Amino acid sequence: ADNLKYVCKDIKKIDDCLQIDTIYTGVCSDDTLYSDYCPMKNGKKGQCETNNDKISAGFIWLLVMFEHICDDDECSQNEKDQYAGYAILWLSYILNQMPNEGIHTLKNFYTNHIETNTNYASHVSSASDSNYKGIVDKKIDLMNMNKAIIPKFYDIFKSLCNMYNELDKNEANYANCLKDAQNFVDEYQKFLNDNNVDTDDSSYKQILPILSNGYDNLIKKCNNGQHSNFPPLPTTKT
């Protein structure tokens, strides 16, 4: 679905607002953006004192926003799985950026900082479901199974998000869509080659739908205001 239009927008919004000194992607458009999701401090309302508090609140804000993409905020099993995967991919990227954190500390960070935030159980609809915990655990395990490629894979996802942002502003006149799609497929082919990615690996097959569905939707949307022959997404290392 055209879900990446919103996912890419929401991730950019939370990135600029993370307020963490060591991580800088931009200026916060709204200082109160995730304040509603800050963890409690000594039984009192949270203000987000630590970097872990801000990441935790930012992650919950993401999940809450992604669920809004579903009709009536009622996500199917497939939507819950897809949105948990996007949020946990972003979380892996953040932990990889943070010094003294990483994909190796992701499971620990989730249990000690996300499940620990009182706003996770009350605002994320599926938080208490055992089916949801299984989805989250699988996504965390997938990040660990692919830990060596996850930071570079995220850069490819970011390049895909840049095309979605361009389409969002140009609307029916994204004249550079074909040129950008060709640069994207070449950049992705280089990612497979440089990292010796076996696209038939079980773990890689479960993160690949983020790019394969995302790219397929993007070129279908560009071909709504133009008429171009877009290159197919690379299938293997070359």
Residue numbers in the entry: 5 to 242
What do the study's own words say?
A complete dataset was collected to 2.15 Å, and the structure was determined by Sulfur-SAD phasing, using anomalous scattering from the sulfur atoms found in the five disulfide bonds and six methionine residues in each monomer. A complete model was built for residues 5 to 242. Another 20 residues, which connect the ectodomain to the predicted transmembrane helix, are missing from the C terminus, suggesting that this domain is connected to the membrane through a flexible, disordered linker. The CIR ectodomain adopts a compact α-helical structure, arranged into two distinct clusters of helices. The N-terminal half of the ectodomain is formed from five tightly packed helices connected by long loops largely lacking in secondary structure. This packs against the C-terminal portion of the ectodomain, which is folded as a cluster of three parallel helices, connected by short loops. Five disulfide bonds stabilize the fold, supporting the hypothesis that the CIRs are surface proteins, because disulfide bonds are characteristic of proteins located in the oxidizing extracellular environment.
Only a few parasite proteins are exposed on host cell surfaces, and these have mostly diversified into large protein families, allowing a population survival strategy based on antigenic variation. These consist of an N-terminal extracellular domain ranging in size from 28 kDa (236 residues) to 133 kDa (1,331 residues) in the AS strain.
